[PDB]
Amino acid sequence: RRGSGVCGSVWGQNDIAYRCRTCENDPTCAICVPCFQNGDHNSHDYSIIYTGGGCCDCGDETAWKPDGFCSNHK
Amino acid sequence: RRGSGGGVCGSVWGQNDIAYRCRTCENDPTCAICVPCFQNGDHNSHDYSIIYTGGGCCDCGDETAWKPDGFCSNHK
Numbered sequence: 001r002r003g004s005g006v007c008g009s010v011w012g013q014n015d016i017a018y019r020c021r022t023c024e025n026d027p028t029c030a031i032c033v034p035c036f037q038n039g040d041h042n043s044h045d046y047s048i049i050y051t052g053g054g055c056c057d058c059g060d061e062t063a064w065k066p067d068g069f070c071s072n073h074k
Numbered sequence: 075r076r077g078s079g080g081g082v083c084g085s086v087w088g089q090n091d092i093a094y095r096c097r098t099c100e101n102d103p104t105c106a107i108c109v110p111c112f113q114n115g116d117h118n119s120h121d122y123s124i125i126y127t128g129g130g131c132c133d134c135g136d137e138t139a140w141k142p143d144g145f146c147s148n149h150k
């Protein structure tokens with residue numbers, strides 16, 4: 001989308017990333033592995049995802065709760 | 075957000091870099107795709123414009139922002 005503090009980092013079709021059902025705005029949202037690990041999802045309902053690729057929504061509050069942002073993306 | 079078959083593009087523009095808006099394909103007026111994705115897709119008869127503003131990241135491959143009919147050939 002257009003506009004300018006978001007990861008937006010990108011993974012391929014057979015690259016892993018993370019889904020977190022506690023932090024996501026909806027089921028199409030996801031974050032990269034570095035941003036998941038530098039955040040805290042203890043007790044959240046998260047899974048590793050294997051398919052589809054994506055751009056990291058870490059730092060983007062239309063797609064991800066701010067409580068769920070990693071330490072590098074406020 | 076996540077891909078749906080052919081992955082996503084996610085390439086990023088700067089403030090004064092151009093890209094394409096397509097009103098036929100967009101989900102809302104903030105969506106946009108990068109020039110390479112526009113060229114490798116089919117928007118004949120669509121109401122598209124070259125846009126010059128504010129930076130962003132390409133939405134090709136993200137079904138929440140762009141009709142899959144309008145995905146480029148490299149994003150399925």
Ligand SMILES: [Zn+2]
Nearest residue numbers: 007032035056
């Ligand atoms: Zn990330």
Ligand SMILES: [Zn+2]
Nearest residue numbers: 035058070073
């Ligand atoms: Zn992050």
Ligand SMILES: [Zn+2]
Nearest residue numbers: 020023041044
């Ligand atoms: Zn979470």
Ligand SMILES: [Zn+2]
Nearest residue numbers: 096099117120
């Ligand atoms: Zn179009």
Ligand SMILES: [Zn+2]
Nearest residue numbers: 083108111132
């Ligand atoms: Zn693109």
Ligand SMILES: [Zn+2]
Nearest residue numbers: 111134146149
């Ligand atoms: Zn594309």
